[PDB]
Amino acid sequence: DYLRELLKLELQAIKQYREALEYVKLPVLAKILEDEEKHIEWLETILG
């Protein structure tokens, strides 16, 4: 639930990085996004 606080936290970071990537096409950003996508898998795996 602390694990649910974490997943929403990632879920927000991906919304904002996506958007960040929307206007500033910077490779470093697609990569951070890659990782946050994996963060999300891993937490939803540990949960439900």
Add this chain to the structure above:
Amino acid sequence: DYLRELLKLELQAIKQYREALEYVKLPVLAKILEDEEKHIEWLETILG
């Protein structure tokens, strides 16, 4: 500044994952933390 919103966002995620790792010693968590540490480098590099 959108890049500053991102860094605080990571800076918080590392506070909470550290803490999350404090009580539930789960390897997946030290690894997420590893990545967030790198997220932070990369953004402070792009900034100041």
